[PDB]
Design an enzyme around this catalytic site. Structure first.
Site, short mmCIF file in Angstrom:
data_model
loop_
_atom_site.label_atom_id
_atom_site.label_comp_id
_atom_site.label_asym_id
_atom_site.label_seq_id
_atom_site.Cartn_x
_atom_site.Cartn_y
_atom_site.Cartn_z
N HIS A 117 10.58 62.92 44.10
CA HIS A 117 11.16 63.23 42.77
C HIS A 117 12.27 63.10 42.84
O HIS A 117 12.97 62.08 41.83
CB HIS A 117 11.01 64.42 42.10
CG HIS A 117 9.41 64.30 40.91
ND1 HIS A 117 8.43 63.54 40.42
CD2 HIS A 117 9.12 65.81 41.43
CE1 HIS A 117 7.96 63.78 39.52
NE2 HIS A 117 7.86 65.02 40.20
N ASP A 126 5.54 60.95 37.17
CA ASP A 126 4.55 61.48 37.32
C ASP A 126 3.74 60.59 36.38
O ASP A 126 3.68 61.29 35.26
CB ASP A 126 4.81 63.50 37.31
CG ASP A 126 5.12 64.27 37.79
OD1 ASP A 126 5.39 64.07 39.08
OD2 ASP A 126 6.28 64.83 37.14
ZN LIG Z 1 5.55 65.96 39.32
#
Ligand SMILES: [Zn+2]
Ligand SMILES: *[C@H]1O[C@H](CO)[C@@H](O)[C@H](O)[C@@H]1O
Length: 163
Positions: A117, A126
């Protein structure tokens, strides 16, 4: 974070470092479609493979055991989270402590997910949560699969094994 939590995180960080190293090596040596790759990243094509290869190259460079960990979060259903532009800091929540060090939805896998991330490592999003959604994303929208954190986690965990 308590002494025990720090000890657990040392084990999880080490396992996550190994997950990333193995995943990177796998991507570097397999430049064609394989079950492990297609299941989590979809149909094989050089550009997408290059994208995931780069993510693992970036994650492989960072020292997981040196991340700044924060254990203040008590949310039971959440494993962990990070702020993409605040590199090196990982906030652990309730679910992280129930999860096994390695395996499916593990502590190590959670760190791989969160690490991917960080903007510095590629800034995955996500788009899908869970194995079912991750695999469906890979099959229906490969473009997003190579950009989904969970798809990286599951590729790394590789449980059940495929390679
Ligand atoms: Zn995530
Ligand atoms: C990913 O998809 C390929 C077919 O395109 C399979 O070889 C593999 O088992 C996985 O489902």
């Amino acid at each position: 974070c308590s002494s025990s939590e720090q000890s657990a995180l040392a084990a999880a960080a080490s396992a996550a470092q190994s997950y990333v190293a193995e995943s990177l090596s796998y991507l570097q040596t397999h430049t064609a479609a394989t079950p492990r790759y297609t299941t989590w990243f979809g149909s094989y094509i050089s550009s997408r493979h290059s994208t995931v290869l780069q993510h693992y190259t970036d994650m492989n460079s960072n020292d997981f055991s040196s991340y700044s960990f924060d254990c203040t979060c008590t949310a039971a259903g959440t494993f962990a989270y990070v702020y993409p532009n605040r590199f090196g800091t990982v906030y652990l929540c309730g679910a992280f402590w129930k999860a096994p060090t390695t395996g499916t939805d593990s502590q190590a896998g959670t760190l791989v997910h969160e690490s991917s991330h960080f903007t510095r490592n590629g800034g995955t999003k996500d788009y899908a949560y869970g194995q079912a959604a991750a695999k469906s994303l890979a099959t229906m929208d490969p473009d997003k699969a190579v950009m989904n954190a969970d798809n990286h986690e599951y590729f790394s965990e590789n449980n059940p094994a495929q390679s």
